[PDB]
Design a protein around this ligand. Structure first.
Ligand SMILES: Nc1ncnc2c1ncn2CCCCn1cc(CCCCC[C@@H]2SC[C@@H]3NC(=O)N[C@@H]32)nn1
Ligand SMILES: Nc1ncnc2c1ncn2CCCCn1cc(CCCCC[C@@H]2SC[C@@H]3NC(=O)N[C@@H]32)nn1
Lengths: 322, 322
């Protein structure tokens, strides 16, 4: 109803205390019996609320559904983000962000439970199952030259990687410059884009897709053998809100490093996180394909590649298969 | 009315022939007496239509108002542009373009007779008087690396300059990298922006503002002494449609050169068009200001500057005052 998000927001805000129907009813100026109806419905959606005669209601567990009311709390206490928008289903959080950034300087993010038109690099389809992942776009406003897009993109990778690590029992590695893996399974893809002119960046838009609870059964057969989710490498139920919150904290940590440190300061760290070394790599460059080895990441974040014919290249980006 | 643009489109299309009310009335499936009403109104708006008993109507002159119906003809015959949008008044053709490019690969342009929120570089106010100029944003789709924004921007300048030259009796010069002058008057500003990621440009958006018929009286007093319009340097009435058409042809010529030639091929041409040489220049770089001389434009389009203290800089962009 009209008041669901508001009841939720008050339940979240008052943890680990109970609040009474009465009291929620006075906050929103609505009837006690309307509070009960709203709470009955939150429980049907799979909210876990402890309801005790005489004492009140306590939010114990949120379901796998993003709630604007709750995300409104993540943004209130945030030093980085002016607001967020949350959607059950959208074409793409990246289209939505590129539309929402026009004409303002806000920083914000957009989450959606499903995407019907998720795209990755080179307009590739990005599978965005309802209820099974974090499909997010983040809009930031670094005051910097357009050439710093590539640098942004290196820092945020370690951000994302640390957030996924904290929940997997298995090893989490970056595949430069845009993919994160747990063993041979792709668990996340992200893409950093910018609006800019000669004078500087007007906005960075970082689309980030993280598989959270798909079983292998839930992926499509064309991608199933090289996909995995955080849940398949966690003994405990993975809690999206707990994940989201960890992720926001890392994005913010790496964004500040991004603004303050040269790439040389995180380069060894990135090196030790990467899974592209001592193994043969397939590169696609339009028409051409060619095999190659990753030799080094240089101080400015270019990949140094020795291809199958002994020739050396220095690359700002690539698409690599294994 | 509902059918104005359609009547107009048919009048434009049939030049230099007359078409009869009867015949327009059969094209649109409407009554002869509705055709007369539509034509009476186009004349009130200041269309110049020759109406001859027995023979019909011929469009002689369009007023200083953009008409979707007519611009629909410029796009139909165009090899570059999928469509256009035309507005009597908008916040900014640049905001509109940045919103319209999301989620598609169309190339298009947006014109508006006035802007209420025109912006130039560094969020400066761009005066966009109703009826007195060309306020346009152009969206193109070069398949190229994000670093080619600066190059795009050099080629389009000569495009714009040639289009303004063709109508002024006086000399038209470029002020690198974003301004065109006729004597000491600023007659146009333009700005090239991009949406891009590491893999390439998703879109170029080029905002172009050209003063067409302001009298010096029509500008604001803060800018009046360094502003001019094409009309103040033309003996003949300047015809916006004739201008627009010339401008589209040059944008297209320079866009193809842009796709095909290295900067070195137009560099001398640009040099001879520029007004920044043999004179003292003020540079703004955030906090700092400093005087300097333009020494050369290099083959990659950087300005070589000897500042007042004998130090040399190599600049991709700048804001220069005289
Ligand atoms: N869910 C998946 N898991 C594993 N592999 C997949 C998946 N889907 C398709 N594949 C096959 C592997 C494709 C490999 N791949 C990575 C990438 C970078 C992508 C940016 C992430 C998208 C995020 S989701 C929120 C945002 N909105 C949006 O519209 N996109 C971004 N490009 N290709
Ligand atoms: N009409 C004017 N004529 C002369 N000087 C002016 C004017 N207005 C303000 N000034 C004072 C001089 C400012 C100098 N100056 C140039 C520039 C590049 C600007 C891109 C052009 C804008 C075009 S109009 C269609 C598009 N939509 C949009 O929203 N913007 C673009 N930045 N500052």
């Amino acid at each position: 109803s009209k008041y669901s998000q508001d009841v939720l927001q008050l339940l979240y805000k008052n943890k680990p205390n109970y609040i009474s129907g009465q009291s929620i009813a006075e906050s929103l100026n609505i009837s006690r019996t309307a509070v009960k109806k709203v709470i009955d419905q939150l429980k049907l959606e799979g909210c876990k609320i402890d309801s005790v005669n005489h004492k009140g209601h306590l939010l114990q567990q949120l379901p796998d559904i993003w709630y604007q009311g709750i995300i409104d709390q993540y943004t209130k206490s945030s030093a980085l983000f002016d607001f967020s928008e949350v959607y059950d289903s959208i074409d793409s959080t990246q289209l939505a962000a590129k539309k929402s950034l026009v004409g303002n300087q806000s920083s914000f993010f957009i989450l959606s439970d499903e995407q019907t038109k998720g795209r990755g690099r080179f307009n590739r389809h990005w599978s965005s199952s309802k209820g099974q992942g974090l499909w997010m776009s983040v809009v930031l406003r670094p005051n910097v030259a357009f050439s710093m897009i590539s640098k942004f993109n290196l820092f945020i990778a370690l951000g994302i990687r640390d957030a996924i690590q904290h929940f997997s029992q298995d090893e989490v590695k970056v595949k430069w410059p845009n993919d994160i893996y747990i063993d041979n399974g792709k668990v996340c893809g992200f893409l950093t884009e910018m609006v800019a002119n000669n004078d500087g960046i007007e906005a960075i838009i970082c689309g980030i897709g993280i598989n959270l609870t798909q079983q292998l059964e839930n992926f499509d057969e064309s991608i199933r053998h090289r996909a995995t989710s955080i849940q398949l490498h966690d003994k405990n139920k993975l809690d999206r809100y707990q994940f989201l919150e960890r992720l926001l904290q890392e994005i913010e940590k790496r964004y500040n490093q991004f603004l303050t440190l040269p790439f040389s300061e995180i380069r060894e760290e990135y090196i030790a996180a990467s899974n592209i070394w001592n193994r043969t790599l397939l590169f696609t460059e339009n028409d051409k394909q060619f095999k190659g080895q990753a030799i080094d990441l240089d101080y400015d974040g270019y990949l140094i590649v020795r291809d199958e014919a002994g020739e050396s290249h220095r690359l700002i980006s690539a698409d690599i298969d294994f």
